[PDB]
Design a protein around this motif. Structure first.
Motif, mmCIF file in Angstrom:
data_model
loop_
_atom_site.group_PDB
_atom_site.id
_atom_site.type_symbol
_atom_site.label_atom_id
_atom_site.label_comp_id
_atom_site.label_asym_id
_atom_site.label_seq_id
_atom_site.Cartn_x
_atom_site.Cartn_y
_atom_site.Cartn_z
ATOM 1 N N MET A 132 0.833 -1.237 0.000
ATOM 2 C CA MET A 132 0.000 0.000 0.000
ATOM 3 C C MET A 132 0.861 1.277 0.000
ATOM 4 O O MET A 132 0.762 2.090 -0.919
ATOM 5 C CB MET A 132 -0.956 -0.006 1.209
ATOM 6 N N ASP A 133 1.705 1.451 1.018
ATOM 7 C CA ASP A 133 2.566 2.642 1.119
ATOM 8 C C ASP A 133 3.539 2.740 -0.059
ATOM 9 O O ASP A 133 4.528 2.018 -0.116
ATOM 10 C CB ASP A 133 3.350 2.612 2.443
ATOM 11 N N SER A 134 3.268 3.647 -0.993
ATOM 12 C CA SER A 134 4.131 3.785 -2.164
ATOM 13 C C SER A 134 5.339 4.689 -1.949
ATOM 14 O O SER A 134 6.148 4.884 -2.864
ATOM 15 C CB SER A 134 3.326 4.278 -3.369
ATOM 16 N N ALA A 135 5.466 5.225 -0.739
ATOM 17 C CA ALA A 135 6.585 6.097 -0.401
ATOM 18 C C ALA A 135 7.819 5.293 0.031
ATOM 19 O O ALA A 135 8.896 5.845 0.201
ATOM 20 C CB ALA A 135 6.170 7.053 0.703
ATOM 21 N N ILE A 136 7.652 3.989 0.207
ATOM 22 C CA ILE A 136 8.743 3.110 0.622
ATOM 23 C C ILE A 136 10.045 3.441 -0.116
ATOM 24 O O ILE A 136 10.013 3.811 -1.295
ATOM 25 C CB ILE A 136 8.360 1.636 0.347
ATOM 26 N N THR A 137 11.180 3.334 0.583
ATOM 27 C CA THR A 137 12.491 3.587 -0.032
ATOM 28 C C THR A 137 13.066 2.230 -0.432
ATOM 29 O O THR A 137 12.558 1.189 -0.003
ATOM 30 C CB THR A 137 13.494 4.255 0.935
ATOM 31 N N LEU A 138 14.123 2.238 -1.241
ATOM 32 C CA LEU A 138 14.739 0.998 -1.701
ATOM 33 C C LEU A 138 15.385 0.212 -0.568
ATOM 34 O O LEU A 138 15.256 -1.008 -0.502
ATOM 35 C CB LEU A 138 15.784 1.286 -2.791
ATOM 36 N N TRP A 139 16.079 0.904 0.324
ATOM 37 C CA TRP A 139 16.733 0.220 1.421
ATOM 38 C C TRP A 139 15.721 -0.435 2.356
ATOM 39 O O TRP A 139 15.927 -1.563 2.796
ATOM 40 C CB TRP A 139 17.667 1.186 2.171
ATOM 41 N N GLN A 140 14.614 0.248 2.637
ATOM 42 C CA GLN A 140 13.578 -0.313 3.510
ATOM 43 C C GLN A 140 13.005 -1.576 2.854
ATOM 44 O O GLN A 140 12.846 -2.616 3.501
ATOM 45 C CB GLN A 140 12.457 0.704 3.734
ATOM 46 N N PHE A 141 12.706 -1.466 1.560
ATOM 47 C CA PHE A 141 12.169 -2.571 0.777
ATOM 48 C C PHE A 141 13.124 -3.776 0.771
ATOM 49 O O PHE A 141 12.694 -4.928 0.888
ATOM 50 C CB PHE A 141 11.917 -2.097 -0.655
ATOM 51 N N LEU A 142 14.417 -3.508 0.607
ATOM 52 C CA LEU A 142 15.408 -4.575 0.600
ATOM 53 C C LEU A 142 15.478 -5.208 1.991
ATOM 54 O O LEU A 142 15.652 -6.418 2.133
ATOM 55 C CB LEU A 142 16.775 -4.032 0.180
ATOM 56 N N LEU A 143 15.318 -4.386 3.017
ATOM 57 C CA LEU A 143 15.336 -4.886 4.383
ATOM 58 C C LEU A 143 14.155 -5.837 4.557
ATOM 59 O O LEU A 143 14.289 -6.917 5.126
ATOM 60 C CB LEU A 143 15.217 -3.721 5.371
ATOM 61 N N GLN A 144 12.992 -5.419 4.068
ATOM 62 C CA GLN A 144 11.787 -6.240 4.156
ATOM 63 C C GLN A 144 11.966 -7.587 3.453
ATOM 64 O O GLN A 144 11.485 -8.597 3.944
ATOM 65 C CB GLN A 144 10.586 -5.506 3.543
ATOM 66 N N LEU A 145 12.644 -7.595 2.307
ATOM 67 C CA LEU A 145 12.876 -8.827 1.546
ATOM 68 C C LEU A 145 13.804 -9.784 2.290
ATOM 69 O O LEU A 145 13.593 -11.002 2.307
ATOM 70 C CB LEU A 145 13.501 -8.511 0.183
ATOM 71 N N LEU A 146 14.841 -9.223 2.898
ATOM 72 C CA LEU A 146 15.814 -10.008 3.638
ATOM 73 C C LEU A 146 15.231 -10.560 4.939
ATOM 74 O O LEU A 146 15.771 -11.494 5.526
ATOM 75 C CB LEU A 146 17.035 -9.146 3.940
ATOM 76 N N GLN A 147 14.122 -9.978 5.372
ATOM 77 C CA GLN A 147 13.449 -10.391 6.597
ATOM 78 C C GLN A 147 12.601 -11.649 6.437
ATOM 79 O O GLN A 147 12.302 -12.335 7.418
ATOM 80 C CB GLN A 147 12.558 -9.264 7.088
ATOM 81 N N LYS A 148 12.190 -11.936 5.211
ATOM 82 C CA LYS A 148 11.386 -13.117 4.952
ATOM 83 C C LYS A 148 12.300 -14.211 4.429
ATOM 84 O O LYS A 148 12.843 -14.103 3.331
ATOM 85 C CB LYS A 148 10.298 -12.814 3.919
ATOM 86 N N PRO A 149 12.496 -15.279 5.217
ATOM 87 C CA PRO A 149 13.359 -16.382 4.795
ATOM 88 C C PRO A 149 12.898 -17.040 3.496
ATOM 89 O O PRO A 149 13.667 -17.763 2.860
ATOM 90 C CB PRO A 149 13.320 -17.347 5.978
ATOM 91 N N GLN A 150 11.651 -16.784 3.100
ATOM 92 C CA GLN A 150 11.122 -17.364 1.865
ATOM 93 C C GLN A 150 11.671 -16.642 0.638
ATOM 94 O O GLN A 150 11.438 -17.063 -0.497
ATOM 95 C CB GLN A 150 9.589 -17.321 1.853
ATOM 96 N N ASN A 151 12.406 -15.558 0.877
ATOM 97 C CA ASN A 151 13.017 -14.766 -0.191
ATOM 98 C C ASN A 151 14.507 -15.062 -0.317
ATOM 99 O O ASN A 151 15.194 -14.464 -1.149
ATOM 100 C CB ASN A 151 12.823 -13.271 0.089
ATOM 101 N N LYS A 152 14.996 -15.987 0.505
ATOM 102 C CA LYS A 152 16.413 -16.351 0.514
ATOM 103 C C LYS A 152 16.941 -16.700 -0.865
ATOM 104 O O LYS A 152 18.129 -16.571 -1.157
ATOM 105 C CB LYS A 152 16.641 -17.538 1.449
#
Length: 93
Positions: free
Chosen positions: A1-21
DNA sequence: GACAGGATGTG
DNA sequence: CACATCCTGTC
């Protein structure tokens, strides 16, 4: 939903889900990470920001801008490997 | 190709 | 500002 997300935050979110390993993973206990499937992560970033034509060429340029911002740095000599400068601070923030 | 960083544009 | 896009060069 939040389209203001930054790239680093987004990358952090991806690294947080082990299903994205599969595409992105931590490669150290101090904030280093590797874009195992760079074009795959770039694809996800574009969908997230609604920039259908996003790719690694452009996602990596966005990461290059972080160097001076002291947010993320490149791990020299290591293909697709970068590092969150102030880790784990950025995590618990 | 990956990577560095400048030029120009957008919201 | 925070990229998105495109580009000149290096390796």
């Amino acid at each position: 939903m939040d389209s203001a997300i930054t790239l680093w935050q987004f990358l952090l979110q991806l690294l947080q889900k082990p299903q994205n390993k599969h595409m992105i993973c931590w490669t150290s206990n101090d904030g280093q990470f590797k874009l195992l499937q760079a074009e795959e992560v770039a694809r996800l970033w574009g969908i997230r920001k609604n920039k259908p034509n996003m790719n690694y060429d452009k996602l990596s340029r966005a990461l290059r801008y972080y160097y001076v911002k002291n947010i993320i740095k490149k791990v020299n000599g290591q293909k697709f490997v970068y590092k969150f400068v102030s880790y784990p601070e950025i995590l618990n923030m």
